[PDB]
Design a protein around this ligand. Structure first.
Ligand SMILES: [Ca+2]
Ligand SMILES: [Ca+2]
Ligand SMILES: [Ca+2]
Ligand SMILES: [Ca+2]
Ligand SMILES: [Mn+2]
Length: 1100
């Protein structure tokens, strides 16, 4: 009141004809001349709409006075025909606005739009001003509040992803007050009697950051002696075009907005934004798939990359079973990053190209269907921003070009990507790409994760473009997910950088807004989770917040144990709260924090209450407001006044199956988890109190160590291991049959079942054990055997007369022969290894040589050992045998994968056998056989993979490309950019191809090399060391300056008597020659690359 009171034009609506539309509880007085609400009335209390007439709209940004005719449709409903004509700006249109009261809601709908100009979605338009592209009712508040009203206040949320900075504004409406003209995602006005919330489908943006997702605009308007704060819908979009081409019809969404009016809705006897937020759930858009979120407790990524097939579709079902047992049936969400093409960041845009080397559409369909019973939902990683020449959808027309006409290059890794123009893509059939995937896959896939979208790589990725993209995905029945905490606010249900707490640091997490989280906490994982070092909202949020970890290869992640502990430490309780809707949010006093380079104030939530449809009430209370107290980072949680979490421990009722379905009373359970040692005591519900109670320790074998608990006056006391999940039931439970590895033709391919029962052991069974790697990955170990030990299992469900490959991962520390043998009943084939000599450098593979997932002695020499065979007519007697001849030291085996394969490598025949060896790379089972990737990049998503032909884009000449990606057929072996490394790129190993002692072989291949002597053919023996081991080097010349195609290389190689000779490709110390090119041009054109094809090795 110390600044000058403000004054404005008075209201004069003495000549206005008003009508009333009303439900039983809500009356709205409306102008017949224009769709303006003068005032809302509910239970004798009022809120203004737009008090000052503004009978104008903005059409394509032009102020227009519409010619309006009114009709009263019925007691609740009025229509306004609004003719829009301005010849000078080529506006000749009409729209109908319907105002309708439904219970305590007012609906504002543009129900019908007619553009009299000729516009046809999909066709060229000569003049964009002919489009009816935007409709704005800015200037007409849908609801407001006046400074003359007691308790007048506005609350609004904007996007903030910085954990120190709340996105919310709380503004008292006073005269005087600060100017206000600002976009909001959510907005409320209230008095001490009524609160109103406003929703709009407007995909307006005023800019990036807090200016985005601004579907509402709040404005201060001084009317007479009073200030009003009014909430307006932001501008709506309609007919739009790109470079003259009108977008498809589905991009037009009819404008809609809603207001909801409420008294006290949480029984705290105060009326404020929280009541408005509760009521707002009845008018708001709901991101499709949101209902599922609360029961997706175990999210993770399973990764494939670079043709390696690290995680075949049917293998992922075994990880789902492991997590099912270990969590006693918590729901799951597995994002398949690398589901398509050759893996992650291969083949982008071709969404329907399901990865062949991981089992194709047939195994993907099986994974989806069979995962349902475990409440496991599958998602896929796609890209709508960048592609590669290999992709069916790579074309000049789709590529993004800079103003100077150069390509907007993407990242160079396996291949040099080029960004696409997403607006062009939308305007030229993007939708059909999703349709093709949906048709091929059928029903059942849960979610689409669109990587990078939001970062502008493909041009406009803002609110409008994101809603269009999400609608294409939702239309196929899929749920939307994206990378950034700030992305997809309207439609996303999952944000990777909100959920993986380690990413981005404190400025780039989930949505830091009490208002937004209150409204939608239960609908998405988009929030600030607990990560103390970020401070602010991340310093122990009372609602928790998803914490994602992984164990299936994503960024080299393999920590299964840590994954499960994390689920219990953060996610069980986070997900518990998502089964309820927030009803009350109470802040404590501001505290001072110091972290991330500043001292700042933060106002922490001290209590949050939640409720469900059955009026269960959950109360979550922070144990101290003192930021220096250990109790600041602790909560008490009650359900109906019963303590279920207190500090370090919880004993939490879980009444839902893996898919969220309510459990029968007798299947109800409770989870216990305590991050500290110590006895804890819990009050049970009376219907548990008079029952026997049974406790189980949860492990990767499911429920173990059954104990009957002693109940005393309805209490139990639990004194158990810290950081260890348990589950409690009212009756004795059993572990069901998991059918490990169903569809993979063998039982329990990964040694997860805790026994070798399905194997027939010939020899001393005490010498064969399932043991844990340094990464807790179970493996078969055979050691210390004086006689042969063999393990045999039938291969089941094979097709007759069909060609197959089978491999087992093998790491042999013994010199003794370790073998895989298949007997089809007509033929026996066998492959073996003596001591393993090649470390494993595949980052997304579970048994790479990184120390934390090493086999033993801090190393892993795991490599896939293959046999190739063909079934005959009878498939009832096909056996696989793993054996180890006598030796002291250990052989490790894991992951037996049998799958169709059509290679013809052995004297032009499929089956393992003698004859000239040939690799044309046209029928590779997986990886780069007979080579394995070397240590040139250490453990990495290796820059060598099988290159796929897409003429002319992948071949010499396209954008000045010097060398072909593919030499002959559809596939070659490509190494991208690994020049000047002085290290081994890849090598054969004896189990893949053996240079027999004292025999001599001719090794021939065709190759492309972009520069002279950057790569060399090498001959070695034993384990490579970069004392550098001895190598016979053959530097290779470039293949383009004096040749129109790949050159031929040929070498004589004699096998060392020790049997451990191999050959490969080595990155020399020589600098490449990029012929004056730099940047993306030099990367694209292949100066730094090496391609091989048509390998042949024959004895001479
Ligand atoms: Ca003052
Ligand atoms: Ca209230
Ligand atoms: Ca295993
Ligand atoms: Ca080929
Ligand atoms: Mn490629």
């Amino acid at each position: 009141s110390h600044m000058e009171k403000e004054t404005g034009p008075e209201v004069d609506d003495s000549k206005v004809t008003y009508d009333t539309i009303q439900s039983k509880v809500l009356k709205a007085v409306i102008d017949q001349a224009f769709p303006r609400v003068k005032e809302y009335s509910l239970n004798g209390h009022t809120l203004p709409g737009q008090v000052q007439q503004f009978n104008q709209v903005f059409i394509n940004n032009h102020r227009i006075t519409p010619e309006v005719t009114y009709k009263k449709i019925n007691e609740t409903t009025a229509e306004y025909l609004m003719k829009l004509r301005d010849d000078a700006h080529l506006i000749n249109a009409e729209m109908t606005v319907r105002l309708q009261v439904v219970d305590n809601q007012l609906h504002f709908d543009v129900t019908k739009i007619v553009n009299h100009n000729q516009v046809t979605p999909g066709q060229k338009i000569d003049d964009e001003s002919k489009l009816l592209s935007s409709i704005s009712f800015l200037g007409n508040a849908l609801v407001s509040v006046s400074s003359d009203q007691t308790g007048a206040k506005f609350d609004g949320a904007t996007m903030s992803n910085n954990t120190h900075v709340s996105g919310d504004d709380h503004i008292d409406v006073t005269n005087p007050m600060k100017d206000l003209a600002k976009g909001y995602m959510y907005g409320f006005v209230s008095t001490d009697k009524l609160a109103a919330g406003v929703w709009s489908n407007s995909q307006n943006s005023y800019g990036g950051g807090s200016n985005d997702w601004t579907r509402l605009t709040a404005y201060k308007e001084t009317v007479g002696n009073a200030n009003y704060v009014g909430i307006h819908s932001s501008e709506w979009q309609w007919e739009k075009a790109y470079k003259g081409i009108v977008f498809p019809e589905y991009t037009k969404e009819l404008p809609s907005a809603k207001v909801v009016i409420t008294e006290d809705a949480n029984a705290d006897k105060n009326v404020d934004w929280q009541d408005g937020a509760i009521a707002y759930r009845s008018i708001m858009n709901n991101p499709q798939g949101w209902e599922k979120v609360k029961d997706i407790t175990a999210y993770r990524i399973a990764m494939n990359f670079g043709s390696q097939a690290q995680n075949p579709f049917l293998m992922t079902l075994d990880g789902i079973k492991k997590i099912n047992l270990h969590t006693d049936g918590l729901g799951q969400g597995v994002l398949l990053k690398g589901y398509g093409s050759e893996g992650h960041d291969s083949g982008h845009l071709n969404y329907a190209d399901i990865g062949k080397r991981i089992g194709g559409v047939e195994d993907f369909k099986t994974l989806i269907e069979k995962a349902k019973k475990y409440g496991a939902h599958l998602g896929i990683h796609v890209n709508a921003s960048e592609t590669y020449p290999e992709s069916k959808y790579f074309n000049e027309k789709i590529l993004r070009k800079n103003p100077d006409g150069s390509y907007s290059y993407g990242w160079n890794w396996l291949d040099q990507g080029i960004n696409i123009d997403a607006a062009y893509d939308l305007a030229h059939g993007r939708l059909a790409r999703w349709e093709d995937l949906k048709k091929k896959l059928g029903d059942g896939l849960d979610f689409i994760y669109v990587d990078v979208w939001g970062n502008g790589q493909s041009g406009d990725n803002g609110a409008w473009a994101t809603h269009v993209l999400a609608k294409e995905i939702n239309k196929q029945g899929w749920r939307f997910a994206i990378e950034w905490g700030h992305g997809g606010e309207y439609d996303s249900t999952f944000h990777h950088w909100a959920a993986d707490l380690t990413y981005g640091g404190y400025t780039n997490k989930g949505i830091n807004s009490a208002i937004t989280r209150f409204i939608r906490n239960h609908q998405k994982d988009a929030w600030v989770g607990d990560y103390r070092s970020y401070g602010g909202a991340a310093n122990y949020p009372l609602l928790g917040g998803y914490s994602m970890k992984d164990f299936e290869g994503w960024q080299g992640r393999s920590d299964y144990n840590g994954y499960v502990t994390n689920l219990f430490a953060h996610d069980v309780m986070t997900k518990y709260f998502q089964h309820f809707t927030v009803s009350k949010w109470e802040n404590g006093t501001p505290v001072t924090m110091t972290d991330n380079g500043s001292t700042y104030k933060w106002t922490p939530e001290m209590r949050v209450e939640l409720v469900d449809a059955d009026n269960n009430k959950v109360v979550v209370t922070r144990k101290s407001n003192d930021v220096n107290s250990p109790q600041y980072r602790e909560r008490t949680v009650t359900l109906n006044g019963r303590v279920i979490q207190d500090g370090s421990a919880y004993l939490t009722p879980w009444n839902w199956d893996a898919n969220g379905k309510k459990l029968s009373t007798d299947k109800e359970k409770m989870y216990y988890f305590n991050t500290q040692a110590g006895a804890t005591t819990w009050t049970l519900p009376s219907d548990w109190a008079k029952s026997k109670v049974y406790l189980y320790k949860l492990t990767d074998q499911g429920k173990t160590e059954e104990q009957e608990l002693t109940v005393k006056d309805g209490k139990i006391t639990l004194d158990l291991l810290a950081n260890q999940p348990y589950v409690l039931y009212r009756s004795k439970q059993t572990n069901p049959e998991m059918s490990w590895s169903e569809g993979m033709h063998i039982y329990d391919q990964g040694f997860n079942s805790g026994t070798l029962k399905h194997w027939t052991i010939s020899g001393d069974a005490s010498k064969a054990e399932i043991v844990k790697s340094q990464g807790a990955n179970d493996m078969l170990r055979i050691q210390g055997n004086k006689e042969k030990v063999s393990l045999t299992q039938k291969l089941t469900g094979l097709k007759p007369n069909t060609k197959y490959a089978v491999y087992v991962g093998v790491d042999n520390r013994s010199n003794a022969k370790a073998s895989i043998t298949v007997n089809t009943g007509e033929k026996e084939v066998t492959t073996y290894t003596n001591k393993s000599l090649a470390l494993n450098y595949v980052k997304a593979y579970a048994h790479n040589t990184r120390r934390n997932n090493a086999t033993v002695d801090d190393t892993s020499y795991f490599q896939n050992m293959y046999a190739f065979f063909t079934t005959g007519a009878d498939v009832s007697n096909v056996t696989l045998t793993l054996s180890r001849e006598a030796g002291d030291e250990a052989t490790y085996f894991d992951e037996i994968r049998t799958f169709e394969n059509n290679s013809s490598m052995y004297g032009d025949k499929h089956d393992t056998g003698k004859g000239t060896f040939k690799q044309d790379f046209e029928n590779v089972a997986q990886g780069i056989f007979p080579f394995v990737v070397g240590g040139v990049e250490g453990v990495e998503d290796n820059r060598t993979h099988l290159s796929e032909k897409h003429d002319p884009y992948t071949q010499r000449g396209w954008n000045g490309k010097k060398v072909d990606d593919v030499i002959e057929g559809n596939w070659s072996l490509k190494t991208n950019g690994l020049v000047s490394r002085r290290n081994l790129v890849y090598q054969t190993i004896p189990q893949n191809f053996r240079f027999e002692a004292g025999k001599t072989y001719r090794v021939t291949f065709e190759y492309e090399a972009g520069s002279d002597n950057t790569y060399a053919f090498v001959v070695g023996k034993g384990e490579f060391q970069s004392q550098a081991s001895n190598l016979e080097m053959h530097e290779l010349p470039n293949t383009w300056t004096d040749s129109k195609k790949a050159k031929k290389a040929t070498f004589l190689v004699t096998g060392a008597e020790t049997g451990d000779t191999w050959v490969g490709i080595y990155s020399t110390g020589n600098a490449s020659n990029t012929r004056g090119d730099s940047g993306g041009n030099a990367n694209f054109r292949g100066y730094n690359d090496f391609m091989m094809d048509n390998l042949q090795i024959e004895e001479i």
